[PDB]
Design a protein around this ligand. Structure first.
Ligand SMILES: OC[C@H]1O[C@H](O)[C@H](O)[C@@H](O)[C@@H]1O
Ligand SMILES: OC[C@H]1O[C@H](O)[C@H](O)[C@@H](O)[C@@H]1O
Lengths: 583, 583
């Protein structure tokens, strides 16, 4: 018995106030009835399906049902209940299930979709401001472990402005900046003033120019939002009594209850770092200052003249009351809600090194840095390591069971805006993590642009910057092309063009077709278009692709890599990734 | 490779401000390191484990780690990360995992536990008031389909009071009553007045007496709370203009915005029943009336003189704003929070025919009617049917994968207070659902008292009342012992005594030991005590129980059923359930 469904055309179609759902089956003992299990206002519904007269593909029986759209919440969850005379079988995002699927692991489509619909059309680039580019108004000194992280190399926002032509050439359409607000460090997560841009990066005037220049170049701009904790030099806290009524040293301070102090008097902070005291969101004035008020920090940078496109929320998972994460979900929801009040299409996403599904499944934020659903699966399958740099021996089966299990908790629209990257300012460079297997790096780059989600390049990844974890992953960008991997740069350029060109790489469903040992093969699917991606992490090999109605096309045009598809046989060279378009 | 862990002593121990966690392993290629993955304030933690010198059981290596308890939220989630030189393996509530488990499917223990700790010590009994017993101040007429459901047979609350000796003999310690407030129907979910008890059931005076009599007999009392919708005869709505300013027929009504009326003017209601208009929780006055105010309905019946022990929340999953379930989780949380303000140990649980995990995993309620986690697994494995009375062919493997998958989303303390029952006033009688397989009924009864959770008898189940779905599952209770299955009655009596006697049936962990085809075997585990339960749904058979360190005891004393355990061989008669205690 076989089944196919993806939460996208040609399988679904909105028509008047109805969502038409289509399921494909094939086999010797086909169920005489199929129930479409849908949900309206959390109530499970048994909607009957009827067999269509016309076979969509050779040997394929199609069933159709309908979800009434006038009632219910925007997120439409559903799955398929196959019924024989004596038994039942569920069809789900994770294949067949002998017992009912989790409600939160069904197929799901957001109709109406109130999310930030521009995110799926973007190529993102993350910039650590000090290490990217100096404006026109020493840079090669090697980063050390003692000093690296306290050393300013002097990049600024005008430097970013001046490099916009390079970033457009690369294919970038959106910037995510690390913290830019006034703060004593080079990274600036120890916020001193949420209202002013640090002069070291060019101050307010330079961020105004960057907003203008990105606007003019059609590029989005996201700022790093640090609200779990403040800096210990902030006027609110003020470790060093640079002011009169700080919270650290005055019981009568207007902000004494914006922090939690123990019975002994030690402030609660972030993972033991005393320069990052944690903000106590029990206090209703702190709530008004961060997101509740009309000119709260969250809304301030989203209205004119700043008009930023959204927020990356630092340490999103620990923000809360009383020195810990109590009432975290409510407060992240409040931040996101405040952001959308100011700008309805604001993109709000959270830093989640761990499992973000509970946050995303309650819709408290649009998206997450997809470390669990994308990054660490690739670290393990490709680089034999993981978040703790513990050894990892997982094959294609396991890698794709993992990636597909995570996605299953997410609607199609949520999947398309997940923030996928290979590394960041808080990890070792992926190129370094590969060690002797560095030839696998182009495979990751292709995967990054073809897996559902929006891709984000970590600055310098594209020209082959390497290095170990913080501080060594914050190397200065090498603008000397003699220090640049130009072949790798071109791969990023070509992939962003493939993604810009083909709707299925931005809007399409995703079906893993083959996942065994060293080879992953999946197809993106949108209307009549198909994009096939074959990844081979090991020696050269041949693989048989079973006749599949998802691949029933006029023909295949190879677009990247040296793989070859003929009569259902994929010939894959050693350590390769290939992409085909259907013609 | 083998592993054992249950979220209970002897595997965990609280000591000063530390939670000691112990893992057992056994095999030829044991990991040289084990990391205890724990979580503090949603931040994943790598806590190292150390090998204990003393083997807890033959051939078993024990690892130990610690969770610091002074920081973090009460719910302590954790799992085990086994590390070799080249690879890792996760150990979880659902056995071994090759990729990381879901955060919300780890082991979990609530320390401190602020839940209603009395629930785990209870045996519940659900009474449909009209059909249970008439007070001392016709009953055999068969229920029909035309009239049944509009016919009053005349049971009342004094009848319940008068039958308390019978219920104590049965082993009952807690009552769950169906709606008792003023309303025109026999079932009374069409609430007319939340402040008064319907005279047909004996009025306010009779519920006062029942509260006194249950108090005096050491019994808990839960009322049915109907807050998703009101009755259409309520003064707030008032379909029939029995008052001056109802919402249905007055745009200026003080409660016009407590309901949602379409552009055409049709009120939103429950699943198309016009006598149950849905309450619009966008309105801040409705919120104050139901749970926000000091004398809101939710708190009213929890303080003196009523002092009820909690609330069963009808249609908990659809309550919300705007005619649907928008902001449902916030409002259920508000109801529960209001209840605990009035009585800190109030038991609040929701009617969930579907998957309740998102509600329970956000702690918006203490528990749920465990239809998904308990009832429907038994309907399928034992009676070949399911919630829709669709055929079901699942074996022991599938049945236990299903039951253990659901539990995995729940902490140990949550599992112990899940509201388990075999049927209710909204289902066919389980005895009828068995059809020709009615000999399996005693198996379900044993299972109901030995699976983690609090058991709830549906009135009359214990003497063999049968019947089909609503209205035929609301037969009058047969007080004529000639119409009573006395053998079945005695089984309930003995099981409640086993549960009252043995801590592991109330507080213990649960490990499925064998689940193949027709046989399920599991053990409840608490400190040094063990309760072994073997269920055989088919013909008589013998089953080998592998040597297991969970079963390494002084000896086994058979307590119920005719099964026999000797030298690791279970001899199980056809269609039987057996229970042993460790001595
Ligand atoms: O938010 C974390 C930031 O501060 C931390 O202390 C790290 O050491 C630093 O590298 C990082 O930029
Ligand atoms: O809440 C549901 C109640 O009303 C429904 O209309 C049913 O028909 C009735 O049997 C039940 O008691």
């Amino acid at each position: 018995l076989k089944a196919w469904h993806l939460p996208v055309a040609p399988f679904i179609k909105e028509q008047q106030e109805r969502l038409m759902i289509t399921l494909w089956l094939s086999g010797d003992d086909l169920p005489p009835r199929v129930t479409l299990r849908a949900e309206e206002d959390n109530e499970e519904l048994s909607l009957p399906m009827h067999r269509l007269r016309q076979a969509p593909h050779p040997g394929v029986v199609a069933w159709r049902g309908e979800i009434n759209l006038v009632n219910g919440q925007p997120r439409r969850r559903y799955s398929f209940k196959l019924l024989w005379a004596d038994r039942q079988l569920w069809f789900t995002p994770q294949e067949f299930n002998r017992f009912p699927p989790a409600r939160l692991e069904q197929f799901a489509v957001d109709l109406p979709d109130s999310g930030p619909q521009w995110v799926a059309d973007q190529v993102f680039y993350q910039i650590f401001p000090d290490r990217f580019a100096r404006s026109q108004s020493a840079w090669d000194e090697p980063l050390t472990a003692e000093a690296g992280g306290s050393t300013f190399y002097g990049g600024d926002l005008d430097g970013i402005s001046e490099k916009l032509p390079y970033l457009k050439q690369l294919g970038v359409t959106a910037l995510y900046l690390n913290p830019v607000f006034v703060a004593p460090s080079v990274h600036k997560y120890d916020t001193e003033d949420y209202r002013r841009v640090d002069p070291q990066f060019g101050g307010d005037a330079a961020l105004l120019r960057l907003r203008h220049n990105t606007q003019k170049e059609g590029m989005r701009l996201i700022l790093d939002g640090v609200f779990n904790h403040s800096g210990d030099s902030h006027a609110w806290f003020d470790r060093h009594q640079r002011g009169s009524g700080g919270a650290c040293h005055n019981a009568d301070s207007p902000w004494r209850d914006w922090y939690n102090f123990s019975p002994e008097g030690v402030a609660h902070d972030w993972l033991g770092y005393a320069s990052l005291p944690k903000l106590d969101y029990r206090s209703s004035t702190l709530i008004d200052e961060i997101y509740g008020g009309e000119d709260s920090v969250v809304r301030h940078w989203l209205k004119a003249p700043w008009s930023m496109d959204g927020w990356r929320l630092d340490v999103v998972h620990m923000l809360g009351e009383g020195g810990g994460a109590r009432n975290n979900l409510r407060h992240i929801a409040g931040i996101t809600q405040a952001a959308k009040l100011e700008r309805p299409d604001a993109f709000v996403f959270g830093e989640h090194f761990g499992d973000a599904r509970q946050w995303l499944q309650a819709d408290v934020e649009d998206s997450a840095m997809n470390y669990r659903g994308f990054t660490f699966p690739l670290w393990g399958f490709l680089a034999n390591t993981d978040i703790s740099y513990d050894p990892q021996k997982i094959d294609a089966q396991t890698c794709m069971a993992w990636m597909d299990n995570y996605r299953a908790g997410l609607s199609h629209q949520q999947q398309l805006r997940m923030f996928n990257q290979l590394d960041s300012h808080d990890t070792a460079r992926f190129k370094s993590l590969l060690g002797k297997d560095v030839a696998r790096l182009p495979l990751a780059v292709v995967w990054l642009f073809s897996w559902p989600g929006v891709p984000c390049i970590y600055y310098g990844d594209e020209v082959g910057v390497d290095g170990n974890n913080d501080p060594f992953c914050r190397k200065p960008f090498p603008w000397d092309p003699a220090l640049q991997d130009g072949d790798l740069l071109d791969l990023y350029k070509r992939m962003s063009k493939l993604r810009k060109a083909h709707q299925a790489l931005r809007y399409g469903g995703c079906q893993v077709i083959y996942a065994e040992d060293n080879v992953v093969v999946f197809v993106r699917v949108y209307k009549q278009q198909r994009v096939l991606v074959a990844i081979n992490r090991g020696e050269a090999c041949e693989v048989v692709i079973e006749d599949s109605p998802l691949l029933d096309v006029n023909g295949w045009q190879l677009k990247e890599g040296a793989g070859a598809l003929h009569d259902g046989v994929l010939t894959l060279p050693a350590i390769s990734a290939s992409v085909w378009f259907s013609r």
